[PDB]
């Protein structure tokens, strides 16, 4: 049974959180980084920790990991989230519209727009889910 304990995981979390810049996907260097940046009192714990670090650093190279916090946040969440297309989806040339929201816009200042194509109203009121 090879499940890792809290003292291994919590350590590995906080080690990456503060020292993401020094770590990689190589066990034997990560092992040797953990020696420098932390007083781990035991070789077995030192490897267990380094070992989970490497496992997390693979999960960081993929999408984002839940219980972790790094400097950038993280160039697909800060930088990419400023993605914007050429023209917005709200820039419809022909907006589909029912006669009943035409009836309410008619009772605003917006009686007639040009880019509102009012559909023939829906027939046979039949929307409820049958019981049982």
């Amino acid at each position: 049974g090879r499940v890792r304990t809290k003292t291994v995981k919590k350590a590995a979390r906080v080690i990456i959180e503060k020292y993401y810049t020094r770590l990689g996907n190589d066990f034997h260097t990560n092992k040797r980084v953990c020696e420098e940046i932390a007083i781990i009192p035991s070789k077995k714990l030192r490897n267990k920790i380094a070992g989970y670090v490497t496992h997390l650093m693979k999960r960081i190279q993929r999408g984002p990991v839940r219980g972790i916090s790094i400097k950038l946040q993280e160039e697909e969440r800060e930088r990419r989230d400023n993605y914007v297309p050429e023209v917005s989806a709200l820039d419809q040339e022909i907006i589909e519209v029912d006669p009943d929201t035409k009836e309410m816009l008619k009772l605003l200042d917006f009686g007639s727009l040009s880019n509102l194509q009012v559909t023939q109203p829906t027939v046979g009121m039949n929307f409820k889910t049958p019981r049982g």
Binding site: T7, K10, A11, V14, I15, K18, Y19, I37, A38, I39, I40, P41, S42, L45, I49
Partner: peptide
């Protein structure tokens, strides 16, 4: 002089 074996003192960067 020796810490608890659980204790993982991380030096502050």
């Amino acid at each position: 002089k020796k810490p608890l074996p659980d204790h993982v003192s991380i030096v502050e960067p």
